[PDB]
C-alpha cells in the first residue's frame, strides 16, 4: 500500500540525510515557490499508524490544519516536509519517530516509537 511504497520508494528530505523523513510527490503543485518560515500554511491531511489505523484527518473534520511554518507548532517532519511543497501539491511523507512523537508518543492516539504515514495537500500559504 501507500505506506510501504513511500517507505521503499521515497526520497530523504532531511538535512541530516538520516532517512528520517521520506517523501513522494503525488501531485505537482503550482510554480516554483515554497512557503517561508513564519508563513501561515493551510493543509489538508490524513495520518496513519504502522498498524493501519487512521489516527487523524482534516477531511473528516471539514476544516484544514493551520500553522505557522518552521516554528515547532507541528512535528518536525511536517515543518521539514511542508517547507518542500508548492501550493496545490499533494505529497506522502513517511516519518520516523525522531521526526514525530518519539518515545513519548501522544495519547490517546499515537504509541511510543511510532513511524507515521501522512498524505498532505498544501492548500495555501501567506505571510502575516
Curated annotation (Swiss-Prot):
The chain holds residues 16 to 140 of 457 of the full protein. Changing residue 16 to Q: Mimics acetylation; impaired interaction with AKT1 and PHLPP1. The lineage of its organism: Eukaryota, Metazoa, Chordata, Craniata, Vertebrata. Acetylation impairs ability to promote interaction between Akt/AKT1 and PHLPP1. Deacetylation by SIRT7 promotes interaction between Akt/AKT1 and PHLPP1, leading to suppress Akt/AKT1 activation. Ubiquitinated, leading to degradation in a proteasome-dependent manner. Deubiquitinated by USP49, leading to stabilization. Widely expressed, enriched in testis compared to other tissues. Induction: By androgen. Part of a heteromultimeric cytoplasmic complex with HSP90AA1, HSPA1A/HSPA1B and steroid receptors. Upon ligand binding dissociates from the complex and FKBP4 takes its place. Interacts with functionally mature heterooligomeric progesterone receptor complexes along with HSP90 and TEBP. Interacts with NR3C1. Interacts with Akt/AKT1 and PHLPP1; enhancing dephosphorylation and subsequent activation of Akt/AKT1. Interacts with IFI44L; this interaction modulates the kinase activity of IKBKB and IKBKE. Interacts with IKBKB and IKBKE. This is Peptidyl-prolyl cis-trans isomerase FKBP5. Residues 30-118 form the PPIase FKBP-type domain. The modification N6-acetyllysine is found at residue 16.
Amino acid at each position: 500500500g501507500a505506506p510501504a511504497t513511500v517507505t521503499e520508494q521515497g526520497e530523504d528530505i532531511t538535512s541530516k540525510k538520516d532517512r528520517g523523513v521520506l517523501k513522494i510527490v503525488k501531485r505537482v503543485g503550482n510554480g516554483e515557490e515554497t512557503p517561508m518560515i513564519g508563513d501561515k500554511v493551510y493543509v489538508h491531511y490524513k495520518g496513519k499508524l504502522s498498524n493501519g489505523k487512521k489516527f487523524d484527518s482534516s477531511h473528516d473534520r471539514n476544516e484544514p490544519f493551520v500553522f505557522s511554518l518552521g516554528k515547532g507548532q507541528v512535528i518536525k517532519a511536517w515543518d521539514i516536509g511542508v517547507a518542500t511543497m508548492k501550493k496545490g501539491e499533494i505529497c506522502h511523507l513517511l516519518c520516523k519517530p525522531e521526526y514525530a512523537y518519539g518515545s513519548a508518543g501522544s495519547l490517546p492516539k499515537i504509541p511510543s516509537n511510532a513511524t507515521l504515514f501522512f498524505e498532505i495537500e498544501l492548500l495555501d500559504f501567506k505571510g502575516e
